[PDB]
A paper describes a structure:
In contrast, despite observations that UL32 and its homologs in HCMV (UL52) and KSHV (ORF68) are essential for production of packaged virions, their function in packaging remains unknown. We reveal the structure of KSHV ORF68 and its homolog in EBV (BFLF1), which adopt a novel fold and assemble into homopentameric rings. The central channel of ORF68 is lined with positively charged residues that are necessary for nucleic acid binding and production of infectious virions. We hypothesize that the viral genome is threaded through the ORF68 ring, and that ORF68 acts as a scaffold on which the terminase assembles for genome packaging.
We purified BFLF1, the ORF68 homolog in EBV, from transiently transfected HEK293T cells. Interestingly, size exclusion chromatography and negative stain EM revealed that BFLF1 forms decameric rings, consisting of two stacked pentamer rings. We determined the structure of BFLF1 by cryo-EM at 3.60 Å resolution and found that it forms pentameric rings that are comparable in size to those of ORF68 and with a highly similar structure. The BFLF1 structure is highly similar to that of ORF68, with a Root-mean-square deviation (RMSD) of 1.09 for the monomers and an overall RMSD of 1.95 for the pentameric complexes. The internal core of the protein, including the first two zinc fingers (residues C54/C57/H132/C138 and C316/C319/H386/C393 in BFLF1), is structurally highly conserved. Small variations occur in surface-exposed loops. Residues 180–240 (corresponding to residues 178–219 in ORF68) and 264–278 (corresponding to residues 244–258 in ORF68) could not be resolved, suggesting inherent flexibility. This flexibility also prevented unambiguous modeling of the putative third zinc finger, although BFLF1 residues C432 and H469 can be modeled, and C214/C215 likely lie within the immediately surrounding disordered region. Homologs from the gamma-herpesviruses, BFLF1 and mu68, were able to partially complement loss of ORF68, although not to levels comparable to ORF68-expressing cells. While we found that ORF68, BFLF1, and UL32 are all capable of forming pentameric rings, the significance of further oligomerization (e.g., the stacked pentamers of BFLF1) remains to be determined.
Numbering used by the authors:
A (entry chain D), B (entry chain C): 3 to 179, 241 to 263, 279 to 484
C-alpha cells in the first residue's frame, strides 16, 4: 500500500515541507546576529559525543507498548530506497517527507508529530546524519564497531570543518589515515543563484520564503555541502545530481550525453569545448521527452556539465550509486511481501559504497571549499587518485579539479 | 592551387598583418594604465576554464550550411605545415596570415572576416594556443583525453606565470609532476633592441608603428616568450630561430657553423671564444648566398650563437623539429591530391615532439625569466637534464645556462 518516492505522499504534506524548508536557511547576516537557532542546533548535532536524534525518537516511540508490525517493514523499505538515491537536495527532502508520512501513519498517538521539524527536534542535518552520512541501519557484526567509530569521528570532524569554514586544528594527514517526476519541485523553488544558465501542480504550490535568513542562497542546509558558493561558474550544489533523483530519464540521458562527448569528435579539442559545442550548435538539449526536464536542464552552464561528468568525485559516486529503476519502477506484486519480510530481517541491505571512500571524499570537499594549507592538499589529492582508481572509476587528476572548480 | 608559407599570400594582405602587429604591443607604461585591451583579452584567453576562440570560430562557421569540401583539406595542409615550423615570431605571423587567407577564400559570406584580428576576437595568443601550444588538431583516441587535460592545466598555469612575472602560488615540483624568403619582413621591422649586433619588396612595405604601447620592445605578443628581456647580451627572442623559419638555407648554414666550431680547433678554448674567433678573424658570415640573410645574421652577438647552438633547450627543439624542405620545397603534383586527402582523414599528422617535454621546457623558461625560489630551480634543472638526455639531445648542463643567459 505504501511505497516511497511517490510524489503524492509529498503533495499532501505541504504544511510540513514548508516548515522544513523554512528552518533550513543560512542566517541572513554573515554574523549569526545573537544566536540563530538552526545553526546552534546543527552545531550541537555534529558534536562528537551527542546522540542521533532520529534513533532517539525511534526508541522513545517503538519501545513503548504495541509497536505495530509491518512498521519495521515500511522502515526497511524506506531504508532500502535511501540506499539507492543520490546524495543531494531532493533526496534529503523526499526522505524526510516519507519518514514523517510513516510516523503519522503507524504511530498516530505520539506526542508532537505535527511539529516534528522544529529546532531542538528532528531537522535536516539530523536526517542526513541518519540516512546518508554514517548510516544507522545497515546490519553489522558485533566485532565491527571499532573501525566504524574511528571513521565516524573523522567524518564528523571534517563535516564540522565544511560548515564552520576553517580546517581542523589538530590534523596531519600523513601519520594518520511511483512513475511521477519531481522536477516541478526543483524548478518551483530555487530562484536564487543556483542556475545562472542561459536564461534566468508542484510549481504552483512551491512558493513560500522566510525572512530571518539569507533568501539568496536558498535551503542550503538540506544539501550535502551546507552552502552554495561558486567559482568559475560552477557551484557546490550540482543540479545534475538533483536531476538524477527527480526524474527517471535523467541518468540515461546523461550517459548518452557522455557517450556523445567521448565519441563524436576526432580532433584534440578540450572537453569543455566539446561540451560547449554540443550544447550550442547541434542542440542536444531539445530532443528530451519531458518538457520540464529539458527546461531545467538547458539552463545549466557547460562548466557544470564538465564538472559533474568528468571531474568531481562525489558526482561520480552519485552517478554510480543511484538506480532509477528502483526509485521509479513497479515491483512484482507476488514477491512484494516476501521482499518486505526479507528486508525486515536485514538480508538485502548491501553497504553500497565503502566507508573510507566517503570519508575521503568529504575530506577532499572540505579542503576544496574552506581554507587549507599545502602539505595536506597535495597528499589528499594523491590518496584520492589512488583510491578512486582502485574502486573502479576514471576521472581527471584531482589537483586540477581542486584548483579550478569549487 | 593554395600552398602555405608562400610569401605572396602575405604580401597581398597588409591591411590585416598591420592590424595584427598593431594589436600585439606590450603596454607603453609599465602599469597597465586603466585597462589595456590586448592584455585583458590575453588574460581571459589563458584562463583555466575558457574556450579556444579558434575552434569556436571554426564551429560557428563550418557547422552552418554547405561547408565546402577541400576546406578540410586546406586546413589539414596548413596544420601539417605548422607541425613542421620553429616556435618563433615569423611562424606565428605566417600561420595567422595563411589562416585568414583560407577563411577569406572558402567562407566569404561570413560576418566579420575583414576585422578578425581585434580584441574580443582572434588575436596572437589565440593563434599560438591553437596551433603550437596544446595543438588542437592531432587525431587522438577517445581514452586519451585525461593525461592531456592535466598537462594542459600545467602548460597554461606556467604560461600565465611567464606573462604575469611571478611564479605560481601553489606548486611544489616534487610530489607533483614556395621558394621565397621572408628576411625582408624581419629586417624591415625590428628596429628596437632585438639585434644589438655589430652595426645598428618586403622591407619597403613593413613600416608602421602604434603609439599606445611600448614601441621599443616590438610585437612581443607574437613570440613564444611574450616579451623581450635580455641579460649578458642574450635575449628572449632568439633571432636564429627566426632565420630557421624565414629562409631555406638557414638550418644547413647553422649546421655547418656548428661543425666548424666543433672540429676546427685542437686546444681547450671555451666555446664562446671559438665562436668569437670564427666570427671575428676568419669571417664565416660573408660566404653566405643570400645578401639579406648574411646581412641580418652578421648583426647577432656571439653570445646569441652560443645560446642557440649549445645551451638553450627550446632552441634545440626548434633546430630539431623544423624541416625546411617541407616549408620551401615543391611537392610531386601526381601525389598532391592523394596527400591532401590522406591528411584530411588524419593519417600523417605525427605528434612531432612529446607533450611532457614541451611542458617541462616552458616550466624551465618560466623559472629562468621570472622570479623563483631555490628548491624548485635545482630540481627542474636535474629533471630537464635527464629528460633531454633521454630524448636524444646533447646540451651543456642546464644550471649554468639558467644562471648565465636569459
Ligand atoms: Zn542514527
Ligand atoms: Zn553532480
Ligand atoms: Zn583549439
Ligand atoms: Zn634560437
Amino acid at each position: 500500500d505504501f511505497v516511497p518516492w511517490t510524489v503524492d505522499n509529498l503533495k499532501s504534506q505541504f504544511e510540513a515541507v514548508g516548515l522544513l524548508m523554512a528552518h533550513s536557511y543560512l542566517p541572513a547576516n554573515a554574523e549569526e546576529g545573537i544566536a540563530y537557532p538552526p545553526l546552534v542546533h546543527t552545531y550541537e548535532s555534529l558534536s562528537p559525543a551527542s546522540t542521533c536524534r532520529v534513533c532517539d525518537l525511534l526508541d522513545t516511540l517503538v519501545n513503548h507498548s504495541d509497536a505495530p508490525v509491518a512498521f519495521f517493514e515500511d522502515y526497511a523499505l524506506l531504508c532500502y530506497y535511501c540506499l539507492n538515491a543520490p546524495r543531494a537536495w531532493i533526496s534529503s527532502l523526499i526522505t524526510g517527507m516519507d519518514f514523517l508520512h510513516i510516523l503519522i501513519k503507524y504511530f498516530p498517538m505520539a506526542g508532537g508529530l505535527d511539529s516534528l521539524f522544529m529546532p531542538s527536534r528532528i531537522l535536516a542535518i539530523d536526517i542526513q546524519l541518519h540516512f546518508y552520512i554514517c548510516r544507522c541501519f545497515l546490519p553489522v557484526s558485533s566485532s565491527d564497531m571499532i573501525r566504524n567509530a574511528n571513521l565516524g569521528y573523522y567524518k564528523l570532524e571534517f563535516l564540522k570543518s565544511i560548515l564552520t569554514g576553517q580546517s581542523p586544528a589538530n590534523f596531519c594527514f600523513k601519520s594518520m589515515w511511483t512513475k511521477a517526476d519531481y522536477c516541478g519541485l526543483l524548478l518551483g523553488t530555487w530562484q536564487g543563484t543556483d542556475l545562472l544558465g542561459g536564461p534566468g501542480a508542484e510549481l504552483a504550490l512551491a512558493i513560500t520564503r522566510p525572512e530571518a535568513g539569507d533568501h539568496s542562497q536558498g535551503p542550503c542546509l538540506l544539501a550535502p555541502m551546507f552552502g552554495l558558493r561558486h567559482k568559475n561558474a560552477s557551484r557546490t550544489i550540482c543540479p545534475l545530481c538533483e536531476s538524477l533523483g527527480a526524474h527517471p530519464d535523467a541518468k540515461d540521458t546523461l550517459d548518452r550525453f557522455k557517450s556523445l562527448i567521448l565519441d563524436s569528435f576526432g580532433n584534440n579539442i578540450k572537453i569543455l569545448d566539446r561540451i560547449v559545442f554540443l550544447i550550442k550548435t547541434q542542440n542536444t538539449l531539445l530532443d528530451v521527452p519531458c518538457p520540464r526536464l529539458r527546461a531545467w536542464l538547458q539552463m545549466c552552464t557547460p562548466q557544470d556539465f564538465h564538472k559533474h561528468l568528468f571531474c568531481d568525485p562525489l558526482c561520480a559516486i552519485n552517478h554510480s550509486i543511484t538506480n532509477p529503476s528502483v526509485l521509479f519502477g513497479q515491483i512484482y506484486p507476488p514477491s512484494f511481501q516476501a521482499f518486505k519480510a526479507a528486508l525486515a530481517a536485514g538480508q538485502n541491505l548491501e553497504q553500497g559504497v565503502c566507508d573510507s571512500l566517503i570519508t575521503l571524499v568529504y575530506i577532499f570537499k572540505s579542503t576544496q571549499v574552506a581554507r587549507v594549507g599545502k602539505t595536506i592538499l597535495v597528499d589528499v589529492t594523491k590518496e584520492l587518485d589512488v583510491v578512486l582508481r582502485i574502486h573502479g572509476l576514471d576521472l581527471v587528476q584531482s589537483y586540477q579539479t581542486s584548483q579550478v572548480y569549487v
